[PDB]
C-alpha cells in the first residue's frame, strides 16, 4: 500500500482533453454563431442558451492549457499569473455553466406554470439576470481566485499550478473548499433542477393527456429528464470524488488505496464535467425543429453566394 | 487472518503504542524466525520510532 502510486494514466489524459476540446469548440461555436449575428435573439430562454453556450465555449477554450499541463506531468510553463487567471477562469465558467443550467430549468418551470407569459417576458429583466448569474459565478470562484497559484513541489521537482492554501492548515482548507464545491457546484443546482423537472412533468402530465398531445408531451418530458440525466451523469462522479477527497483531508479515511484511486480518477472526472459542458449544446439548442432547417440554410449560404 | 489484521494496523497505526499492541498480538499468535523478527520490531515500537517500526513490521 504505502508504495508510491502509478503514473500510467497520464499518457492518455492530454489526448482526451484535446478530443473534448475540438468537439465542444466546434459544437458550441455553431450554437453561438447561430445566435450572435444571425437573427434568432429576443427570447429569454434563447438568451439563456446563448449565455450557457458562451460559458461552455470559453470554458473548453482552456482545455488545451490543461492538456499541455498534464502532458508535462504537472510542470506549469506559463507562469503564476497564468495559473491564477486560467484557474479562476475555469472555475468561473464551470459555475456560470451550472448556474445557467439551473436558471434555464427554473425558466422552463416558471414558463410551464404560467402559460400567459410572452416570449419577450420583460427582456430587460433578463438583461439584469444575466449579470446577476455572472456575478454569482464570480463570487463562487473567489476561492479559486485567491488560492490557485504556482507552487514549487520539491518532491516532484515541479512548479505545479495548485491551490496554495496555508500549508499549516492546508488539509482543513482543502476539505472546506471541497465541500463548498459539492454544495455550490452540485448540491444546490441538483436540488433546483430535480424539483423543476418534477414540477414540469407533473403539470405537463395533467395538461395534455390524450392523443397527439400525449406524444409531443412525452417527447418534451424525455427532454427534461434528459437534461437532469446529463447533468447527473457528467457531474456525480467528479463530486463524489471531491467528497471522498474531503473526507480524506478530514482524516476519516486514510487508506492509501482509496486516496490513490481518488487522485487516479480525478482528472478523468474533471474531463467528464467538461464533457457535460460539451454535450449541453446538443441537449438545448440542437433539439428545436427549426434548427435543422436553419442548419441547411447555413450550409447553402456560400452556394447562394456563388 | 489475525496476522493480516495486525499487519493492517501498522499501516493504519496512530502512534507507537498501537504498533506495540499489534506486534504483541502477532507474538501471541506465533506462539499459538518470525518470533525473532517480531521481537526486534517490538523493540522498534518501544523506542518510539513510529514510522521505522511500521516499516519493520511490514517486513
Amino acid at each position, epitope marked *: 500500500c504505502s508504495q508510491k502510486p502509478s503514473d500510467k494514466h497520464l*499518457d492518455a489524459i492530454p489526448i482526451l482533453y484535446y478530443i473534448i476540446f475540438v468537439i465542444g469548440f466546434l459544437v458550441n461555436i455553431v450554437v453561438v454563431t447561430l445566435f450572435c449575428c444571425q437573427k434568432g435573439p429576443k427570447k429569454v430562454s434563447s438568451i439563456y442558451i446563448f449565455n450557457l453556450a458562451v460559458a461552455d465555449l470559453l470554458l473548453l477554450a482552456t482545455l488545451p492549457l490543461w492538456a499541455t499541463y498534464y502532458s508535462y506531468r504537472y510542470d506549469w510553463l506559463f507562469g503564476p499569473v497564468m495559473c491564477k487567471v486560467f484557474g479562476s477562469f475555469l472555475t468561473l465558467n464551470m459555475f456560470a455553466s451550472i448556474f445557467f443550467i439551473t436558471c434555464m430549468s427554473v425558466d422552463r418551470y416558471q414558463s410551464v406554470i404560467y402559460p400567459f407569459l410572452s416570449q419577450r417576458r420583460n427582456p430587460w429583466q433578463a438583461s439584469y439576470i444575466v449579470p446577476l448569474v455572472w456575478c454569482m459565478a464570480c463570487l463562487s470562484s473567489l476561492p479559486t481566485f485567491y488560492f490557485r497559484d504556482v507552487r514549487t513541489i520539491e518532491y516532484l521537482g515541479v512548479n505545479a499550478c495548485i491551490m496554495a492554501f496555508p500549508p499549516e492548515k492546508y488539509a482543513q482548507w482543502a476539505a472546506g473548499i471541497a465541500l463548498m464545491k459539492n454544495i455550490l457546484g452540485f448540491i444546490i443546482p441538483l436540488i433546483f433542477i430535480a424539483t423543476c423537472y418534477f414540477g414540469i412533468r407533473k403539470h405537463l402530465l395533467k395538461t395534455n393527456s390524450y392523443g397527439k398531445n400525449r406524444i409531443t408531451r412525452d417527447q418534451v418530458l424525455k427532454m427534461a429528464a434528459a437534461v437532469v440525466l446529463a447533468f447527473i451523469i457528467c457531474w456525480l462522479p467528479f463530486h463524489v470524488l471531491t467528497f471522498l477527497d474531503a473526507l480524506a483531508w478530514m482524516g476519516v479515511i486514510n487508506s492509501c488505496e482509496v486516496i490513490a484511486v481518488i487522485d487516479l480518477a480525478l482528472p478523468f472526472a474533471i474531463l467528464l464535467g467538461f464533457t457535460n459542458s460539451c454535450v449541453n449544446p446538443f441537449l438545448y439548442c440542437f433539439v428545436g425543429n427549426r434548427f435543422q432547417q436553419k442548419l441547411r440554410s447555413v450550409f447553402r449560404v456560400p452556394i447562394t453566394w456563388l | 487472518e489475525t496476522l493480516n489484521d495486525n499487519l493492517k494496523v501498522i499501516e493504519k497505526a496512530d502512534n507507537a503504542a498501537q504498533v506495540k499492541d499489534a506486534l504483541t498480538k502477532m507474538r501471541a499468535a506465533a506462539l499459538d524466525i518470525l518470533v525473532g523478527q517480531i521481537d526486534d520490531a517490538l523493540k522498534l515500537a518501544n523506542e518510539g520510532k513510529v514510522k*521505522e517500526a511500521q516499516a519493520a513490521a511490514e517486513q
Partner: antibody
Amino acid sequence: DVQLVESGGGLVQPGGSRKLSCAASGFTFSGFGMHWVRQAPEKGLEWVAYISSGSSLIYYADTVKGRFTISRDNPKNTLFLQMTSLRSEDTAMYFCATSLYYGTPWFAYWGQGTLVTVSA
Amino acid sequence: DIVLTQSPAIMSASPGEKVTMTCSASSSVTYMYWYQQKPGSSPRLLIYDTSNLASGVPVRFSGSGSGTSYSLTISRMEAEDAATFYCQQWSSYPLTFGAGTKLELKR
C-alpha cells in the same frame, strides 16, 4: 526499455568550457525531470544538477551553482549541461539519470556516463 | 548541506549471511535512497523512499530507518550482491550522497 546516452567528454584545461549532451529513448521524454550526477575517479557519487520536464524548476549543487548551466531540448529528446570555468575537482565521470517518475529526486534509470578530465 | 556517513566502509560477508549497513545524516532527513554500483557499470536503484523496494530489485534487499538513522539489509547474501552501496538523502535540494560501503564476498 529506456536508454540514456551521454557524450561530450574529453580533456579540458582548467577554466575551459564544455557542453555535455544526453540523448534519451524508450519513453516520453517531455514528461519527467532529469538529473546530472558525476562521480570522481576512485571516489563516490555526487549530485550535480536537476531540471524539470518543462525546464521550470532547476536545481544546482553548491559546488556547481553559478558556474554550470543545465538545459533541455524536449523536441529533440536531449539534456544539455554547459560547464564553464572548470576546476581540478570537476574531473569526473558524468551521468544523466532520471527517476522516470515525475522527476522525483532519485535515479532509477542511469546513463552510460562520459569522462571529463581537467588538467593542463 | 546534509552530510551522510555510512558504516562500515569495508565489510566481508559469506554467501547466505545477513548483511546490514547503516547511513547516518547530520540533520532530520525526509527520504533515503539506496543504490548499488559494481565496478565498471552504472549504479542501480535498490531502495526508494527509505523502505520501498524498487522495481526489479530482489526480495532479499530491504531498506529501513527514520530521522537521522537509516539502514540497508540483505537477508541472504549472494555472489551478485558484492558491490559498493550508496545512500542518498532528500529533505531539500541540493541532493547529497553517502561515502559508500564496499561489500566484499568472503572467500
